From a paper:
Most insects, including human-targeting mosquitoes, detect odors through odorant-activated ion channel complexes consisting of a divergent odorant-binding subunit (OR) and a conserved co-receptor subunit (Orco). As a basis for understanding how odorants activate these heteromeric receptors, we report here cryo-EM structures of two different heteromeric odorant receptor complexes containing ORs from disease-vector mosquitos Aedes aegypti or Anopheles gambiae. We determined the structure of a heteromeric complex formed by ORs from these species in complex with a Apocrypta bakeri fig wasp Orco that is amenable to structural determination. We find that these complexes form asymmetric tetramers containing 1 OR and 3 Orco subunits, where activation of the sole OR subunit upon ligand binding suffices to open the ion conduction pathway.
We first focused on the conserved OR10 receptor family, which detects indole and derivatives in various mosquito species. The cryo-EM structure of an OR/Orco complex has a 1:3 subunit stoichiometry. Aside from the different extracellular loops, the OR10 and Orco subunits have very similar fold, despite having only 15.1% sequence identity. Importantly, the residues in Orco that are in direct contact with AaOR10 in our structure exhibit 97% sequence identity and 100% sequence similarity to those in Ae. aegypti Orco, providing a structural explanation to the ability of Orcos to substitute for each other. The cryo-EM dataset of the unbound AaOR10/Orco complex contained two distinct subsets of particles. The existence of active and inactive states in the unbound dataset suggests that even in the absence of odorant, AaOR10/Orco is an equilibrium mixture, consistent with the well-characterized high baseline activity of insect odorant receptors in the absence of odorant ligands. The strength and shape of this unmodeled density suggest that it represents a lipid molecule co-purified with the heteromeric complex. The long tail of this density, in turn, is wedged into the groove between the S3-S6 and extends into the transmembrane space, helping stabilize the inactive conformation by preventing helix S6 from moving towards helix S3. Thus, both the presumptive lipid and the phenyl ring of Phe136 appear to stabilize the inactive conformation of AaOR10/Orco complex by holding S6 in place.
Author numbering:
A (entry chain B), C (entry chain A), D (entry chain C): 4 to 159, 168 to 243, 313 to 474
B (entry chain D): 1 to 375
């Protein structure tokens, strides 16, 4: 928790560790043992509740509406389990990523801009972390509240169903005092930890992307005065200075590309899995929305599920698109300087940089797609079109 | 300075257009060709509007209605811009003459093969159109029940009671010939022009790969002149493609819009026929529509692909040992060549086999969903 | 209304202000206070009538056909309200854009082309303004005429609905004289102002694009003789002259890029909302057209709605596509000159320009799409496909 | 069996010849005659059984479910016949492709990397061959096992049909000892040979692609030290050394391009035919999956058909995508070296290589499409969408 990219993301790492996200790497070995057991217990509890949900779906399968609702809950809560298992197996790549920026480049003339944009990146990471934390807290509170204001009955005659926040089969009574209170506390803890693990991993991905984008902005900002450094018909010392500046620029650009590739590997597999789950989730949600008839609780729940799913997709897409735009803008900022006064070497460097920036940096879901606002727009269009088809056929 | 009729690639088509006096001569044949066909097409459209209580009759007549409407549109646009087509074919002839004098076995065989393919494709197109048209005009005889080859509806006229029927049939068959004469040669001309574009592109690729032969490296003037000539040839090809684009662009936009509109109804009608023989006619219609669209798209795609491969042709040259300046010139040639020389349809959609595949996928999905819902 | 890009657009600005489109920036302070009041009143009236329509939709919700008709009218008239409210909140970026070309570059040799293409841009802007104004006037006249020929009766038995140009709930009698006349005049004013508001904002967007395209044409036209100037084995003075020409070309290109980015910022989000409303409008219109059976009044209304909607989309797409094609043509025109004879400096200039022009300038609807004739084609194909699905399933 | 690309792929060629895949080119003339006869017999038998299948489909056409099943089997087994006939007619281009790499380039400094990457390519080809062979054997075993555990009965009432692995009409009893046993052995042989033929041609295509990718990797790996060789003011001998290194690099790149073009021709027509058949197969399979109700045998058969079809498509797409990404990576690795410290010649070489690699190498199905993971993604989306529409319409 001392060197770059782990000193910047340290609050994120601490939140991930606290929520039960393994990652036994960034503290004294004294905490290595205790922390570990905690993680296991959390997973156990998660799976336990998950299992208790799945069993409930078995005898709820007689009908179709309850089956669809149960399946949507099952996938919504499948996301955190997949993320929690995915991190430990791929932990070597995650640590390799987090150790990329330990030893970065340095030039005397571009130190001020480097510091400014590093600080700006840290600030934006903190802002994103706090925003997503607030969103998850709001989601948990809304879930609990809507569970408490709805009517807990089942359609068969009227059958009283336990007033629980997540449908589940419990050996406990789940109706009287002790069972009901224990179930409520357990389900609250579940919700909180599941949302926390899922969103912590997602926010780590997005924070990596934020750092990359801020480094690209620093590159452009110093691209502007680099040429003026070259433009002056240069003495030997000036030639060496221009060579050093070009070296710094190119090496930092390559460093940014390295970071992007590492992030791409790890969370590319992660995003492939995420969207594979989200597709079925959204299909079932479109069918469920076909059933809305103005009721507050039913519509509230359906729109909440849709909002959460599309919000996760939208976060990934926002930051992927930002990386793409930043690389293309690197091209544009390479063009828009005073290269017509620079020496031949500086102009050649400009040409090669503009060649490189012809393709935008991007993160792909294991080569099957890219994360961009185009992907989000396509997902939205697909779900809307499927809903229209469903209403027409009905 | 050769002639339009002397160039083997464009001769046949020009001759046909010369016979009906559209492009090279202004005798009276133009009006006898155009006026009767346009009047017949108008009467076909009137018959379309009249007879629409039976979708089968509507579609069977509408196919020919749209076919001859496209024929009329093509011939009108041709007579309107005869100068542009004439100058384009004259440039084709001049460049053909210039290429034929290149002393290189690969280029000569390339030119010969593409000229042969162009002429064979044109003659084929013509013969196929003639045979299909004759089959359609003779089809009503077997049907009986006083059916006309195409639609026609003159207000207040019983066209299927008196010897009227006979004279209407005769005039229809007679007017068949000029109509196909105006329709097919545009497709043949597009094929031939695209083929000559490919000929020019591949000649330039060969020249790029073998430009340093018979030139001494010490004298940079000759190398500079040769690369200048290569650049000018690339610009020539670009201009050729741009003009061919504009023309075929507008005409093909109209044609493809009409063809898609007709194909939708044809797919609809495919699964509603119980006649057991009208389904054969529907399949034939689909075959001709798809074949024409495929010809257009295939030749446009080949133009695009060879234009792109000009970049690889530039890369594979002897540029390692040339002075830096020539290397920069070849770098610029590679830069430009990587943009395909597309032939856009309406200036909206480039014509490529990807577009044809997309149309095919749409048609397949539409037919499958139609068959499913109608079950 | 003195310096560039506001003197050029000044007729458009006056038309926008006259209809009540705020724009409290381009006149003497004496008119500041009265004009503002007028704007507010206009907005009020609009909303008033708008509300009166919404109320009408509430008690006309028993059936589905009239519900669809009312929804289509409501979205059609929602467009002006969104535009009207959207300008003032973003007015700062708009004023930033209109002041972009106040201080442009200038070279002694390239002045004539600049003047010629500036004049051509002005003429095309005026032509576009007049064409769209005529289109709106024709639209309102057709609306009034169709409303007058049709029969004002609503299905139940037969019940005579008030003969009004827009269905609306009024406290007045709306059948005798005074109410009928007041409603007719009020609805005529509402139509005129709504169409004028929406189309004025759209025309300002398109005029920005027109100016950018004409500046690109100027750049290509002077690209042709720039190399001739460079080609000549040069002396010191000629070297300075070609350097100045390259500086002029590059800086003017960068200025055009700045203008395009500003235009994207200002009107980026307006296009997104426009298409968001359109999608729903076109879906409802496809359902409505499914019901056409040859009746002149019904078919005329449906055709008018579809024509207006697709016309707005088509205007945006036409001018976005023109910008895209003009930038690509910059690439082509950079290639097609005697760059192989120019000095090494001019050759490097051409290389960098051709690298830059690889990607086409474009305007995007908040990164969710680009405005091009491809977008209009896709919209048209989607609506046609949905109509086919509706008819087949019926 | 002695020159490059046929010495490396010799096990694959032997597997091809062994299953009756013609290829009368890489053995002593003594085997030229007998082998030919063998091929013919195999083909005959295949066709015979194939015909014997088609005849059955004629009298199984009264019902539609068995018609769909028979059509799916017929297309599945049409794949190997098409491949088997397709190779001999196009054998000239196949031999031309196999003889591409007989006379490579050579440089003293880049011999180590060349040998290393050649060995790596050979190892990967062997791995791919073994993996696909195992998959084929597993598929045959699963087919036979499923055929044996299921119930051989037809609905008319209950009718006992012959217990055969592929439904087929035979002149014999096909029920008692002799007929049943002969049919079982014949069908086992048919399955083994058909799957081996198809998969062996596919594996040869993919092995060509693997070789191309490994050669690109060698090119990047040696790109890295070439620039350093250049960077040192270079004496005449050093300049000649740099030029020789650049010549080697360029010539090897062109060689890889030639190989890619040849592979593209031959198997591009092959893949056009392949995916043409696969589309209809997947449509029928979607309709079949619509009928699944949890029964093990039926669901197992449908899942196996889908898995085999999508596995073939996925193999082609994986290796096409690898080629595309490898060429783009060549661009990136050309950028990421110490070119700023080089001489003018090396910098120009870097510029030209980066410009060339802008468009990636790829294989197309006769210009109709490209083989990439995007093609597989589109195929999967199409089949899933069709299935969803089917279930809704039911």
């Amino acid at each position: 928790k001392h060197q770059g990219l782990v000193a910047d993301l340290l609050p994120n790492i601490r939140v991930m560790q606290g929520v039960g996200h393994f990652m036994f790497n960034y503290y004294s070995e004294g905490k290595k043992f205790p922390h570990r057991i905690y993680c296991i217990v959390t997973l156990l509890l998660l799976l336990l509740q998950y299992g208790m949900m799945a069993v409930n779906l078995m005898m709820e399968s007689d009908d179709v509406d309850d089956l669809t609702a149960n399946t949507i809950t099952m996938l919504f809560f499948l996301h955190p389990i997949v993320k929690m298992i995915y991190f430990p197996v791929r932990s070597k790549i995650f640590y390799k990523t987090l150790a990329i920026w330990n030893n970065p480049n340095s030039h005397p003339l571009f130190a001020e801009s480097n510091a400014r944009f590093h600080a700006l990146a840290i600030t934006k990471m903190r802002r994103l972390l706090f925003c997503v934390a607030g969103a998850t807290i709001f989601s948990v509170i809304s879930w609990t509240g809507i569970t408490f204001i709805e009517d807990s009955v089942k359609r068969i005659t009227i059958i009283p169903i336990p007033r629980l926040m997540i449908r589940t089969f419990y050996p406990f009574n789940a109706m009287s005092g002790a069972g009901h209170v224990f179930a409520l506390i357990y389900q609250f803890y579940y919700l909180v930890i599941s949302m926390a693990v899922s969103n912590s991993l997602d926010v780590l991905f997005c924070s990596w992307l934020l750092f990359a984008c801020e480094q690209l902005q620093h590159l452009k900002a110093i691209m502007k005065p680099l040429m003026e450094l070259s433009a002056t018909g240069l003495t030997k010392k000036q030639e060496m200075l221009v060579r050093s500046a070009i070296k710094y620029w190119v090496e930092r650009h390559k460093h940014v590309v390295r970071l992007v590739t590492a992030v791409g590997d790890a969370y590319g597999v992660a995003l492939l899995l995420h969207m594979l789950t989200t597709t079925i989730t959204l299909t079932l949600l479109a069918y469920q929305a076909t059933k809305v008839n103005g009721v507050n609780v039913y519509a509230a729940t359906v729109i909440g599920y849709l909002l959460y799913t599309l919000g996760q997709v939208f976060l990934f897409c926002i930051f992927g698109n930002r990386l793409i735009e930043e690389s293309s803008s690197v091209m544009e900022a390479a063009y828009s300087c005073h290269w017509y006064d620079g020496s031949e070497e500086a102009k050649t460097f400009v040409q090669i940089v503009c060649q490189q920036c012809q393709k935008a940096m991007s993160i792909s879901g294991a080569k099957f797609f890219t994360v961009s606002l185009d992907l989000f727009a396509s997902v939205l269009g697909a779900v809307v079109t499927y809903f229209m088809v469903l209403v027409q056929l009905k | 300075m050769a002639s339009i009729l002397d160039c083997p690639i464009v001769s046949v088509n020009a001759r046909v257009w010369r016979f009906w006096s559209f492009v090279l001569k202004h005798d009276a044949m133009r009006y006898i060709s155009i006026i009767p066909v346009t009047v017949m097409t108008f009467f076909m459209f009137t018959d379309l509007c009249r007879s629409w209580g039976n979708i089968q009759e509507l579609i069977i007549k509408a196919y020919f209605a749209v076919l001859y409407f496209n024929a009329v549109l093509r011939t009108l646009i041709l007579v309107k811009d005869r100068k542009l087509y004439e100058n384009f074919m004259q440039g084709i002839s001049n460049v053909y003459f210039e290429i034929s004098h290149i002393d290189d076995h690969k280029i000569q065989s390339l030119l010969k093969s593409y000229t042969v393919r162009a002429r064979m494709l044109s003659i084929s197109n013509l013969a196929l159109g003639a045979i299909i048209s004759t089959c359609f005009v003779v089809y009503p005889i077997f049907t009986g029940e006083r059916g006309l080859p195409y639609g026609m509806f003159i207000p207040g006229l019983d066209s299927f009671r008196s010897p009227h029927y006979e004279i209407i049939y005769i005039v229809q068959v007679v007017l068949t010939f000029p109509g196909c004469c105006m329709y097919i040669p545009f497709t043949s001309f597009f094929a031939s022009t695209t083929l000559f574009g490919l000929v020019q592109i591949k000649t330039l690729q060969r020249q790029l790969q073998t430009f340093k032969d018979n030139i001494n490296s010490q004298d940079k003037e000759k190398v500079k002149a040769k690369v200048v000539k290569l650049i000018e040839d690339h610009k020539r090809i670009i201009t050729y493609v741009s003009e061919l684009n504009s023309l075929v662009t507008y005409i093909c936009f109209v044609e493809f819009l009409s063809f898609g509109m007709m194909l939708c109804a044809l797919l609809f009608l495919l699964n509603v026929i119980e006649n057991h023989a009208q389904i054969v006619i529907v399949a034939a219609y689909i075959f001709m529509i798809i074949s024409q669209i495929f010809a257009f798209y295939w030749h446009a795609n080949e133009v695009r692909e060879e234009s792109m491969n000009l970049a690889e042709a530039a890369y594979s040259g002897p540029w390692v040992e040339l002075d830096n300046s020539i290397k920069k010139k070849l770098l610029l040639i590679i830069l430009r060549a990587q943009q395909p020389l597309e032939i856009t349809v309406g200036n909206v959609y480039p014509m490529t086999l990807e577009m044809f595949q997309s149309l095919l996928n749409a048609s397949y999905s539409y037919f499958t969903l139609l068959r499913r819902v109608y079950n």
